Protein: Anoctamin-1
Amino acid sequence: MDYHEDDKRFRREELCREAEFLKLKMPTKKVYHISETRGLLKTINSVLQKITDPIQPKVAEHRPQTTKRLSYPFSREKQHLFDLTDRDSFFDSKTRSTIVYEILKRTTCGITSLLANGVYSAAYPLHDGDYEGDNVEFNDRKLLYEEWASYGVFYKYQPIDLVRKYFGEKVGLYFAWLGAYTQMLIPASIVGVIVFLYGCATVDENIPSMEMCDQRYNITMCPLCDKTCSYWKMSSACATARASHLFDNPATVFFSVFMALWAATFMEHWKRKQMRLNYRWDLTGFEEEEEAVKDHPRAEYEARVLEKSPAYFTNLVSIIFMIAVTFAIVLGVIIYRISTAAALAMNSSPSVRSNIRVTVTATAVIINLVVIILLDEVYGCIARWLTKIEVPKTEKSFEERLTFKAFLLKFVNSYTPIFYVAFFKGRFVGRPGDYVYIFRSFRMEECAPGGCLMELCIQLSIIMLGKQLIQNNLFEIGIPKMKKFIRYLKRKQRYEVDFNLEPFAGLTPEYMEMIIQFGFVTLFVASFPLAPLFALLNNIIEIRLDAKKFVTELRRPVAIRAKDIGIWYNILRGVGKLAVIINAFVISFTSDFIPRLVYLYMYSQNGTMHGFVNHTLSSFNVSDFQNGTAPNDPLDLGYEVQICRYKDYREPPWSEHKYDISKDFWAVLAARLAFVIVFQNLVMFMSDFVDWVIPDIPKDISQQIHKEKVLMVELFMR
Amino acid sequence: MDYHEDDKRFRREELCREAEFLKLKMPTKKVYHISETRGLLKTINSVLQKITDPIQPKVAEHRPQTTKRLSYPFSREKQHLFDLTDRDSFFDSKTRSTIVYEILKRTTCGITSLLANGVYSAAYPLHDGDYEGDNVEFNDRKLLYEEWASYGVFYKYQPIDLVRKYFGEKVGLYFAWLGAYTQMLIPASIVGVIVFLYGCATVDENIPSMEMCDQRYNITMCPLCDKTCSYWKMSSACATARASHLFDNPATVFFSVFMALWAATFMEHWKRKQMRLNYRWDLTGFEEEEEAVKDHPRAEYEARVLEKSPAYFTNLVSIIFMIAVTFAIVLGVIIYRISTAAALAMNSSPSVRSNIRVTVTATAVIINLVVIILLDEVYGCIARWLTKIEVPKTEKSFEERLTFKAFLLKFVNSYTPIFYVAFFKGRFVGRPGDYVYIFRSFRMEECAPGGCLMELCIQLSIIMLGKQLIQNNLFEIGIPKMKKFIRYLKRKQRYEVDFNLEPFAGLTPEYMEMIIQFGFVTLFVASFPLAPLFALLNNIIEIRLDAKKFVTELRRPVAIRAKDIGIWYNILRGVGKLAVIINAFVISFTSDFIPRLVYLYMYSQNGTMHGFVNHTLSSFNVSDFQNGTAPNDPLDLGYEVQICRYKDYREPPWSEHKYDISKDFWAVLAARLAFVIVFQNLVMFMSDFVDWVIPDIPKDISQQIHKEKVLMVELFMR
Ligand SMILES: [Ca+2]
Ligand SMILES: [Ca+2]
Ligand SMILES: [Ca+2]
Ligand SMILES: [Ca+2]
Structure:
């Protein structure tokens, strides 16, 4: 318990004499406006500040803001600038802290470099009362914990009009965004499960999967290794083909079109929603540009320029940034190589002959993810330092610029193994005659038995479950408690309670996870349905986890008022527009959908497909290995062996040309590229069409603000 | 000579008794505001109106508009709403006519259905003085004719600040737009001529043109006709190949990229320019929506609804519109067919044996253009009537909706023969074995000897010269003089002079020609450079022709104030965005650029190309015609004949497969589609990049309006 103030202060009680020389000069400028009283307690002393009344409408009339009025037509109170209330207890704690903070920034000798220098350690508003606790006189924060930030309440709606009142429009605007995103994930998950279960129903009705699961063919493939791998039968790995038909179903194409159109209609819905939320709170968006002070090393450098009394260096460090992006790109694939090459050629030295091929893939991906989790912090640090070097003008430019430079890095290292698996996996190996030897010592890399699509789906699967759901939430809960143990192992007053809390670190690491997750929703659902489902399961946990992090474990933000999410809308629209071309390439060049359609329409010799797998397998002759690249010990799976088969669209060896590129390769390639053109153009046009149709401003808000303006006129004239 | 009034009136002097019963009830409502006097002269009587002073600041204060002030910092006078002048002769004639016209619309019993009923025939402001003439006391219109609307002055700049003062911001804004477009055409024409002359320099240095112009091959082609055409030699038509290399030069690809980027930078330049023109005239764009009265059959239908006291029918008539678009599309190709089939199989009955093949093409295109010129008016009329049926709410909705429905029609019938020539010409004929017989009586259509690109370039050429430059300007001058002869063959006072002038008919037919011409600039310069040149030559003539049409042959517009061109910006951005994909298809599928690159990189057997024309020609055997489709009288050009050649990428007849589709067809097709993907994506990204880079608001205007706002504050507080 105490009396009723606004903003605290945290000095460091015992150079030092200049610390006290500035520590008693600033508040002398603070005497004229705000009545301060300093308190002396156990650990480190603090400074207290209570606002005085008659300067508060000086600041409330200094800036234009809307406050509640007395008149109400149609069951709803109007708002104008500042008049007609007269309560002396109607200024909420949030707005009081806003005004007091404006005085905290305005007067100079603000707290930018005064706080950033070392004399002051923390400047922050306090909260009313306490969550849970005992015998509390109806706290707002207790109410908010009891209705919003509990795991037991995840079905009831977001109380957005209260969280705006207690945290401000920025923090309120975030949870509104996450609410609309999770609400839009419901039909995505329903349609995802319907398409996947349509996949599950008709697995054993198709032709091309039966052709592999059939016995009595005795068809043999080439060993896919340099020295030590043997011949393998087609019907051996047939579960992977069964799951392949579970994933590259002809309903998934329709699901991809549905997802592009889904992302577009989500953009429309959210524009409309923040428009009505800009109605309900603050309508005149004309904040005065160049309002705050400049960034202090720009004033320092500017002072150096005035001592001396650059359009080369910003572009120079932008090129530095692009360099870092390029070797980030190659670094991801480097680390993926190291990961798949964690345990190579271990067939011999244990001599147990497991041949399980599971631990190499599983621990490859898991070790890979450990290196990505470890490296992400480094990239964040390079973003902060580089943006510090560039010397932006304001705080807004620092926030925006740092946001973009962090996003490119996390995009690159968080997505590049999936680009390597989905596209560039088994493209570049030659015929079984000659192999493409990278580094001139051994082979590049070979695909899975039965298609590289499985490695994409299980890699993508354990990223949607590994890093997103379990790892990130477990550290997101786990870190602040451990910082609490660190800060401990080295009747209580209010600010002494709030000092033990952790300081607040912006909204960028909390939007960031959601932009990357949105990238997982829209960029790779051409080859993997039911991804939204995983996004929804992560999302329900994320909203309440973040809410409990606000109410429980953090001190209060200072309630910066803004009217849109900002740069994140451009990032969402960019990613959602990039999704179309990458879905076209995933469908055509990966999904094995084009060769089946071409075989149905050009080499059928009947109505349907049969002998498709007979058609793809390019017969080879085992006499033509390059003196050592033969299988080292042939398995003798049957009596003998004469010819191995492989899938590359090449002519048989007995023809007058052997081991060249056939007609069918160019036919399939032409059909693939034609699909890319048609898909990209039609889906760009549809995704534009649902922008042109849906009204970007809502009607009810336009007519209601028009009626409010008219009634404001006819009420004002009297 | 007369006294000084604002707005005229034209009644029809002798049902009739109701005409006079309303003719003396409206002006009784006009007595209260504006002092009218009626005059009685020779032909038909008129009514005169002079404004009275003290109601003019009632209307000038009724609406907010900016007028000149007394203070001037930095050599330029400020503007605010209405004060501080006090001249009683400072209201220009344009603004006086604006206010008087607002009273003409406001009071009701406005002149919408009062003028549209039949009692009033014309309501219009008059002009001061007269152009040229004799002894005129420094007319504004004489000045404007002497500086702007004369053919002798086409090099000196547009006097935009005077034409705005005399005609208003709409008509001024148009000539600003045409000024910026013609100014942007200068480097387009320079680079066009440089690329074309680079084509002209190195004609006789290449390989594939020499291969056709070479003698001593004795290579013979198949006759390309059903019954009566003979074998023709390759070296016969070699001028057409010479011009083909003049057009599909590898510099034209660079010119196509340059044109897409040119269109984008033109958009940026014009956004910036109308922004500063919105600075110089009127800055607060907040015109009150729903300001004027509704459209009178919507009030009539609304009255019928109120007698009765539809979201199906508007969409029904939209589908009607789409139907009209579809048979417009097929109608263009129908009329093109009739045109090329004007004189078919005339080799026999004259028996002169000219074999000139010129008159069929030339008169085909000319007859085609006559039908398009004749049909365009019909499509315009269907646009007006259909838009009349749809019953829009306002005048603005009628203007916009009619604009769009006119544009789709003129787009379709004005472009469809060029789509037929550039794309679908010789694609769909089979091998010389079997032909694709449309209508089951005779062959479809065959390409030119030496490529269908020539027919595209000469058709496109005589549209850029035929319909654009000569036909349209000749009728645009020719029509109003003939209407003057018609109106004649059935000391003078001012309104009696202005009555002989022709009424003004909006800006839509004058923007329309320029949007279609812009379509000719950006949509087909992949296969035809130096098109801008023709656009520039048309454009210089067009600006002065239109200007002389405003000053000389038309009565005055009523000066509607607007702040942008409107729908035409969306139409320009749409066409300029459609240009990229159509340039990709013109380069790949028409320009014969891909097969030369593929032959250079895959079948070279050396460094360079030689025997390219040897490679393309698919040898055929003349024994395999279908019993009558043989050449009827073989020409006996040599001793005998055994095999004819043709260009379709098919295997020779002596192989184990004959007359099927070879490997090389799929190879070339795959390369073509790959070029479409790469070109479309990279040019979309560049055309976006020059939007992201260039600041869409100018800096000087932003800082200058900020300084104007600050100085307005510190001048207002005193
Ligand atoms: Ca998380
Ligand atoms: Ca989180
Ligand atoms: Ca013209
Ligand atoms: Ca014209």
